[PDB]
């Protein structure tokens, strides 16, 4: 048990999951790494594996990767990629018999692609796979050339199986350089949500899929109709035909609320439905952070114009209206967690009292009679959080670090429970 627990909790391949963005978490879960205890170190890396092998096409994303010393090693896999039972990477394809595409799918391993020829999705089909041109381009072994219509036998499934979910979101990618696509994908990874999401104007169409597949938002486990709505919970009258006999209850879903992320951001689900309206199985019912109606929404829509203006856009500087900041379309929320501990040194146990020598009553005013602030009271920088004295008692109360200044939302108090509790506990 200790071995498995230490492997899970501390391993250079066991990474710390990123919560700030549904796209971020999904691309972190779909990540592929060549590192870890058994790979190769960054310093001892060789350029041969740094580059993209001409067989990466269709399975290995050529875009999703961080920038820095660890470049080209933490890349991701393609959208339609699926693993092989032997641990290999296997990709879909469309079989073609003579001149017609077979709608049935066919999965192909990597090495097996070597002695084959596969047509491209950009080639048009007449009515049932009949190619518009009998001399179509193709790729066989790390090369492209023009081949006869009967020469090819396999068809790529679509145009999307060449990039990954991390990069497929960026629209109009058919026109830009690779480097800017790389940078844009990384920034998409590093996005932050807002207090009220708004739909992006130009999208890709897979936003619904990425929203529904990830559990950041709520999804209807079973069909039925809405029976009761609440700002924190949802009650659904399941339909009698959809329910299975024996269990004739109705569905309950407790929406989560403002909670700490793993990157100091906020999480909450917004109920985006009303009463007296049908719902279906596998359907979005409540919107999580940075989404609307089950559609992804990271940033906002700006009326933008390109023009030099007095050097205020000197090289890449940006101008923002006092209008937009006035109407608060960008303001975010941050959650800080402060934990104060009390040990037991040789000078007696630590006390968490409220009476401390050499203190001001103004600071104690925001405190209670035991020395712990209430719920919902604003606190500024430098102020004390929880009374604590080190017994002559040393004033080791928790203080507000400078700069950060907001209001308390939650309080959690814990101890070795089998000793005693005080009035606050």
């Amino acid at each position: 048990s200790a071995a498995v627990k230490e492997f899970f909790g501390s391993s250079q391949l066991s990474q710390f999951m990123d919560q700030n963005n549904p796209l971020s978490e999904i691309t972190h879960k779909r990540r592929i790494s060549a590192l870890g205890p058994g790979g190769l170190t960054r310093e001892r890396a060789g350029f041969e594996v740094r580059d993209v092998h001409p067989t990466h096409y269709g399975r290995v994303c050529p875009i999703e990767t961080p920038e820095g010393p660890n470049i080209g090693l933490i890349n991701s896999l393609s959208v339609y990629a699926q693993t092989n039972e032997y641990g290999f990477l296997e990709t879909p394809y469309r079989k073609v018999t003579d001149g017609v595409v077979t709608d049935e799918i066919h999965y192909l391993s990597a090495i097996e692609e070597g002695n084959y020829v596969i047509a491209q999705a950009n080639s048009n089909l007449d009515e049932e796979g009949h190619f518009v041109e009998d001399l179509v381009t193709c790729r066989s072994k790390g090369e492209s050339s023009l081949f006869s219509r009967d020469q090819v036998d396999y068809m790529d499934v679509s145009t999307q199986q060449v990039v990954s979910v991390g990069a497929s979101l960026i629209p109009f990618l058919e026109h830009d350089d690779a480097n800017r696509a790389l940078m844009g994908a990384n920034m998409q990874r590093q996005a932050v949500p807002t207090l009220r999401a708004d739909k992006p104007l130009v999208g890709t169409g897979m936003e619904r899929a990425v929203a529904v597949d990830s559990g950041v938002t709520a999804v209807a486990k079973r069909g039925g109709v809405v029976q009761y709505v609440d700002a924190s919970r949802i009650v659904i009258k399941v339909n009698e035909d959809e329910m299975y006999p024996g269990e004739a209850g109705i569905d309950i879903y407790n929406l989560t609320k403002y909670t700490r992320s793993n990157q100091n951001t906020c999480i909450n689900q917004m109920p985006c439905v009303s009463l007296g309206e049908p719902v279906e199985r596998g359907d979005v019912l409540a919107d999580g952070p940075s989404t609307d109606l089950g559609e992804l929404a990271l940033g906002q829509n700006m009326r933008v114009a390109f023009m030099p203006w007095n050097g205020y856009n000197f090289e890449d500087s940006i101008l923002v209206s006092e209008r937009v900041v006035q109407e608060d379309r960008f303001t975010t929320i941050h959650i800080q967690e402060l934990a104060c501990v009390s040990r037991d040194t040789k000078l007696g146990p630590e006390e968490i009292t409220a009476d401390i020598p050499n203190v001001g009553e103004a600071a104690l005013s925001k405190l209670d009679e035991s020395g712990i602030v209430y719920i919902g009271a604003e606190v500024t920088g430098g102020d004390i959080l929880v009374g604590k004295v080190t017994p002559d008692v040393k004033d080791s109360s928790l203080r507000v670090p400078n700069g950060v200044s907001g209001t308390v939302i939650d309080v959690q108090v814990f101890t070795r429970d089998g000793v005693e509790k005080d009035k606050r506990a």
Binding site: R50, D51, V52, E67, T137, E143, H175, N179, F314
Partner: protein, 1337 residues
């Protein structure tokens, strides 16, 4: 308080003088209290009082007995800081060895005694025995012995037998022996000896001992008998909980050694038997060695749970050693790190600062002003008032800011401009507003970069900040030549928009009084921003001496040009702006202004240009849209033909006519041609898009397409980017580097096929990975460059030297890439300048050439003048200002004291970011033909054929200027002559690339004798040749016995006799080398000049290994002697090659591989310093045979060619000066100061010789040889011992310096840094010069 440091061994009496008492017991503290004992380790009587100004008993209370001792406790009434330094000693009953000389690989005791340490260690621990003249006849003083031998010799002699043991015996032996007779006998032996392996060790020994005798130290002091003890504070023992302690490792070792000494004292108190004398002394020896350095010999921790204890060395060496991580790399307060932005409304000498960090940083200054005004009474009152930030704090901080500059830098401080200073201006927010232009200097984009701001304290710091780090004072490039306030991207767009001219618009054709009302029409919007208005304007001319005479005249121009002439300063010609102003031109504008008006006009003019550029660019307005990137129509059609022809080429492979490889070349070349066609089509289309009528008929003119302005103006992008986005993006290479045969016919405006994009992917990832990896190697490289040139400080102005030869403009084969005038710009002449006009001297010698004398050279067509150089400076540990040249940061000549070496190192290191890690000849210009090294013979046709492979040809302009230069490959015919005025496009030489000819020099028949048929020459009548050809197989290729005479065909006259080169050298019998392909059959009349045989034969790493002087895979051997070359014998492997000089010690051979090509023949009259083989050249021989000046030119040419290939220019002075430090060492040939061959400092040897000749008139002194050494190795060979001890092998270097009595002169930089003393290079240079001039005078 000093200016130099000497290091030497200690003297026991001097050690006692350093000490202040003797320690008796290890009782550092007493129980039941917390007060140290008087006779314990923590002694106040020896170290001082732990209570300030008080004796332990406290009887004298800090007013009536200040400084005097207490009769009860023997401690002076003083403060505690003396306890930080006051220290004592321990007297050892028996002397002990200093184990470093024991443990050092060059064991000083072993080297001095010429005996390894194995027996020495045994006698140290009393295993073996030391004889001390046990017998006068049998053995010597320096022999090993055993106890049984001790017993045997005692029963042998007894009376004269004597053999003492241990460290005391070693000390007695070494003391008893002298060093003089040693030095004479060693010098006698080295004078007459032949063995070389022991010769090096003997030279090291004699050098060590002769340094020792001068040092005056005593070897017995090396065997210390008193050990100093460090002050108690340096061994921290904080009282832990319940009367515990941290138990510092020093205290445990001191307790161990004091206990051992007490046990030894007890053992000698009762005359104990010798059996335990040896054991006790030995155990005390392990104790003292462990205290000195544990883990080196026995790993006797004895004080921990199998973990080491820091004994003494851990506080000296290792990264835990405080030296180079406590004075190199550290935190600092009084600074702030934050993100940045642009405040496009500030002066160049200003930078914004938000309120919060301003108040936080300057609050210590606020309190000083606060109490000065007296508004606050106490420190707490001021703190709590400023806690509320009342109205007064803002105005007082505004008052204090206005003269108090601050320092600013970015994290990657690549070069000198990485740090600057600014006058703060308070702003709101939490972002650092920065002046726009200086943003280019930092190379700091606004993608989120963080900069840190620091603050000086003393008035000296503020004054030097105002003097130097004001960005106003930093305008030109310290690197090469140019202002760094070159206008940025947006500004040049507006400036280019100013200087345009359409054919018809509102408000044109009228005349204007001046620029004043000209803007009035534009501001009223009654005229175009650009027209053909005619204006009369007034200008100023610097022609008068100090006076700007005014003149005026009516001129046609554009409206915007008048607006710019509004703001242009007084003394500038008007035509500089009358053209289409571009990005490159405007920069030169500033340059021209800097060359006329000075500094303040330049800075204010640049600021005003920036203001006007932003204002009018915003006023104009120019975005880019889809309709702007118009697609040329024919481009698609073009590729169609290419496609068709490609298909045709495929048929050539389909029909079997051609193979894929040549088909590959055909298709890639035709694709490149189609790319060129479409690119020229699209640039033509965009070039003249606009066609505007004027008074009826239409007429074309330069386009106003947005992309065309971003292209032509030079603001950003290039024709390559436009070609990519608009036309054919071209076909790139696969990741292996081979070009794929499939071009990507589309551009970015149109869509791309997924396969095309995927192919395009890995090309970009290659560059991205290269850039990501680039940040590591380059900076480390810079490190290796600064260490070698760490000091390089100018010390005096002029040494009077006049050396160096012929700095000349370089021609790179084709057209010249850099002329003379810019190359010699900024240099100061050494030799007088003679115009090629029969003694019509232009510039006198020892005069600065800034521009005017350079301006005097073009009309006089002078093409080769030498100036002063650092390599040709004969000073001592310094460089002359008149030997270096003009300062780069300032127009005037360099002043005294500056550290040129550091500037050169940083300038050379900075461009690494721009550099990636990975048959006939035709004349092209009109001029005269000049051939260098004229060695040629007229052929039968009457023309010339070269008989020397080192001959070179050049094209000289009819005015004497050199225009072309081409090396002549051997056996190249001539189709012209020297001095023939020939225009471009005229071939002169012909030869074969893959076959080289060997040619006779005399006419006559060829009687084929002096070869063996079948063995040497083979009648290989192949079908293709169809004749009895002669092929001279090599000795290994042919039979060994047959190829033993070096076959030579005998060219004969009509008499069939071996005709000679007439009376001069040698017969016509030319020794045929291996594989001599001869078509001659027998007795063929061959004239002179007719061929006899036909032999069928990473920029950054380049910089790195050319600075490492690493030997390449092919060391090209060279003839380091004169005379006729010859051929050596044949050996087991690589055949020996011998040379035959006409005189001297001519029978010299060398070891030569034969598998590689040997372009040498018997009748090659080689000279002193010409190549034998071919290929890459190691710097060693180039230095050693053809002088220092030749090798300097090669390396600097290589590095500047690499940088120009990268398209980055840096002045040669910076790259050249380190080369002078490259040659910091020399060896000795004729001795008289060194032993025979001491490779050591060249400057020290030269300065020793120069005085010696004048003092010891008659002595030869020393004949030397200035040899090179790798920059890493040269850094390891620094004379500054502290600098070497900073980062490697600290213990060894300090020991070898101490034994030699080294006296470091502290002339470097790292040494000043590590001690923390003021560097005598910058402002401290004068201060130290002032201190020595006034004080100690």
């Amino acid at each position: 308080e000093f200016d130099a440091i000497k290091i030497a061994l200690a003297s026991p009496d001097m050690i006692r003088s350093w000490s202040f008492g003797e320690v008796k017991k290890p009782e550092t503290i007493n129980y039941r209290t917390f007060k140290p004992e008087r006779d314990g380790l923590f002694c106040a009587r020896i170290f001082g009082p732990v209570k300030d100004y008080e004796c332990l008993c406290g009887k004298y209370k800090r007013l009536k007995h200040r400084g005097v001792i207490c009769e009860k406790c023997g401690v002076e009434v003083t403060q505690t800081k003396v306890r930080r330094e006051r220290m004592g000693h321990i007297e050892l009953a028996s002397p002990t060895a200093h184990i470093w000389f024991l443990k050092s690989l060059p064991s000083r005791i072993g080297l001095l005694l010429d005996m390894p340490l194995r027996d020495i260690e045994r006698v140290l621990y009393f295993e073996s025995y030391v004889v001390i003249e046990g017998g006068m006849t049998n053995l010597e003083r320096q022999q090993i012995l055993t106890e049984e031998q001790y017993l045997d010799a005692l029963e042998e002699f007894g009376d004269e037998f004597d053999a003492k043991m241990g460290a005391e015996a070693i000390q007695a032996l070494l003391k008893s022996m002298d060093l003089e007779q040693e030095c004479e006998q060693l010098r006698e032996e080295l004078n007459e000896t032949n063995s070389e392996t022991k010769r090096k060790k003997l030279t090291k020994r004699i050098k060590l001992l002769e340094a020792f005798v001068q040092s005056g130290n005593k070897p017995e002091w090396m065997i210390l008998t008193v050990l100093p003890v460090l002050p108690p504070d340096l061994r921290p023992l904080v009282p832990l909980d319940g009367g515990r302690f941290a138990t510092s490792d020093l205290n445990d070792l001191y307790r161990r050694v004091i206990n051992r000494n007490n046990r030894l004292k007890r053992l000698l108190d009762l005359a104990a038997p010798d059996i335990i004398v040896r054991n006790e002394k030995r155990m005390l020896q392990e104790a003292v060695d462990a205290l000195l350095d544990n883990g080196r010999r026995g790993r006797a921790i004895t004080g921990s749970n199998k973990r080491p204890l820091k004994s003494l060395a851990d506080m000296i060496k290792g990264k835990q050693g405080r030296f180079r991580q406590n004075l190199l790399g550290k935190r600092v307060d009084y600074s702030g790190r934050s993100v940045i932005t642009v405040g496009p409304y500030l002066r160049l000498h200003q930078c914004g600062l938000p309120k919060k960090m301003a108040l936080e940083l300057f609050k210590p200054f606020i309190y000083g002003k606060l109490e000065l005004r007296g508004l606050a009474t106490t420190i707490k009152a001021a703190k709590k008032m400023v806690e509320r930030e009342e109205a007064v704090v803002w105005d007082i901080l505004d008052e204090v800011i206005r003269e108090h500059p601050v320092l600013l830098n970015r994290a990657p401080t690549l070069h000198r401009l990485g740090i600057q200073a600014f006058e703060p201006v308070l702003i709101e927010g939490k972002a650092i507003q920065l002046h726009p232009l200086v943003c280019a200097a930092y190379n700091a984009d606004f993608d989120g970069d963080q900069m840190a701001v620091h603050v000086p304290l003393t008035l000296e710091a503020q004054l030097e900040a105002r003097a130097l780090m004001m960005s106003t004072n930093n305008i030109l490039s310290p690197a090469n030549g140019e202002p760094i306030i070159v206008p940025s991207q947006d500004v040049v767009l507006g400036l280019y928009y100013m200087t345009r001219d359409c054919v018809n618009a509102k408000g044109e054709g009228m005349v204007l009084t001046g620029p004043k009302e000209a803007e009035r029409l534009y501001r009223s919007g009654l005229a175009s921003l650009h027209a053909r208005v005619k204006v009369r304007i007034t200008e100023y001319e610097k022609d008068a001496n100090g006076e700007l005479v005014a003149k005026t005249s009516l001129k046609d121009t554009t409206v915007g040009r008048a607006i710019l002439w509004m703001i242009v300063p007084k003394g500038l010609p008007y035509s500089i702006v009358n053209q289409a102003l571009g990005k490159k031109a405007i920069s030169k504008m500033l340059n021209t202004c800097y060359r006329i008006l000075g500094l303040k006009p330049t800075v204010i003019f640049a600021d005003q240009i920036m203001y006007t550029g932003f204002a009018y660019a915003a006023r104009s307005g120019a975005s880019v849209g889809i309709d702007d990137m118009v697609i040329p129509e024919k481009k698609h059609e073009i590729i169609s033909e290419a496609e068709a022809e490609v298909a045709e080429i495929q048929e050539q492979f389909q029909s079997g006519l051609v193979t894929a490889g040549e088909r590959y070349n055909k298709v890639i070349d035709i694709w490149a041609a189609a790319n060129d066609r479409v690119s020229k089509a699209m640039m033509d289309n965009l070039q003249t898009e606009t066609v505007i009528n004027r008074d009826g008929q239409e007429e074309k003119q330069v386009s106003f397409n947005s992309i065309y302005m971003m292209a032509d103006s030079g603001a950003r992008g290039s024709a390559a980017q436009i070609r990519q986005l608009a036309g054919m993006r071209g076909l790139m290479a696969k990741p292996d580097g081979s070009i794929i045969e499939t071009p990507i016919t589309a551009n970015f405006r149109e869509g791309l096929n997924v396969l095309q994009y995927f192919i395009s992917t890995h090309g970009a990832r290659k560059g991205l990975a290269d850039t990501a990896l680039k940040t590591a190697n380059s900076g480390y490289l810079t490190r290796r460059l600064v260490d070698v040139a760490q000091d390089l400080v100018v010390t005096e102005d002029d040494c009077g030297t006049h050396e160096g030869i012929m700095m000349t403009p370089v021609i790179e084969g084709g057209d010249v890439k850099e002329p003379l005038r810019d190359r010699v710009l900024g240099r100061v002449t050494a030799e007088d300048v003679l115009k090629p006009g029969t003694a019509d001297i232009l510039v006198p010698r020892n005069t600065l050439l800034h521009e005017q004398w350079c301006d005097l050279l073009e009309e006089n067509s002078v093409d080769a003048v030498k100036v002063r150089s650092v390599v040709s400076c004969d000073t001592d540990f310094g460089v002359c200002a008149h030997c270096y040249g003009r300062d780069l940061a300032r127009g005037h000549i360099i002043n005294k004291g500056e550290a040129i070496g550091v500037i050169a190192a940083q300038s050379i290191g900075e461009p690494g970011t721009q550099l990636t890690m990975r048959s006939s000849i035709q004349v092209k210009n009109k001029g005269s033909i000049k051939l260098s090294n004229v060695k040629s013979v007229v052929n039968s046709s009457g023309k010339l054929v070269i008989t020397s492979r080192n001959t070179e040809l050049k094209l000289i302009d009819e005015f004497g200027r050199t225009k072309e230069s081409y090396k002549v490959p051997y056996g190249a015919v001539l189709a012209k002559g020297d001095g023939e005025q020939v225009a471009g496009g005229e071939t002169v030489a012909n030869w074969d690339p893959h076959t080289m000819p060997v040619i006779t020099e005399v006419s006559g028949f060829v009687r084929f004798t002096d070869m063996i048929d079948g063995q040497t020459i083979t009648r290989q009548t192949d079908e293709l040749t169809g004749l009895s050809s002669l092929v001279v197989l090599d000795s290994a290729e042919r039979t060994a016995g047959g190829k033993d005479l070096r076959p030579a065909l005998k060219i004969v006259d009509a008499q069939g006799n071996d005709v000679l080169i007439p009376g001069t050298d040698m017969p016509a019998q030319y020794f045929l080398p291996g594989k001599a392909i001869v078509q001659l059959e027998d007795g063929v009349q061959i004239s002179s000049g007719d061929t006899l045989a036909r032999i069928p034969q990473g920029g950054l790493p380049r910089v790195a290994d050319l600075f490492e002087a690493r030997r390449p895979k092919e060391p090209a051997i060279l003839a380091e002697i004169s005379g006729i070359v010859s051929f050596g014998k044949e050996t087991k492997g690589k055949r020996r090659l011998v040379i035959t000089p006409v005189d001297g010690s001519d029978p010299y051979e060398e070891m030569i591989p034969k598998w590689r090509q040997l372009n040498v023949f018997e009748g090659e009259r080689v000279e002193r310093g010409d190549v034998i083989s071919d290929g890459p050249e190691a710097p060693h021989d180039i230095l050693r045979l053809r002088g220092v000046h030749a090798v300097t030119r090669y390396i600097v040419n290589e590095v500047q060619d690499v940088y120009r290939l990268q398209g980055v220019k840096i002045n040669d002075k910076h790259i050249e000066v380190i080369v002078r430090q490259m040659l910091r060492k020399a060896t000795i040939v004729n001795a008289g100061s060194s032993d025979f061959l001491e490779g050591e400092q060249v400057e020290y040897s030269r300065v020793k010789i120069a005085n010696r000749e004048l003092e010891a008139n008659g002595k030869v002194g020393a004949t030397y040889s200035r040899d090179l050494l790798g920059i890493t190795k040269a850094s390891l060979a620094t004379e500054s011992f502290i600098s070497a001890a900073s980062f490697q092998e600290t213990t060894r270097v300090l020991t070898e310096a101490a034994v030699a009595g080294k006296r470091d002169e502290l002339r470097g930089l790292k040494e000043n840094v590590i001690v923390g003393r003021l560097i005598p290079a910058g402002t401290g240079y004068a201060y130290h010069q002032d201190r020595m001039r006034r004080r100690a005078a």
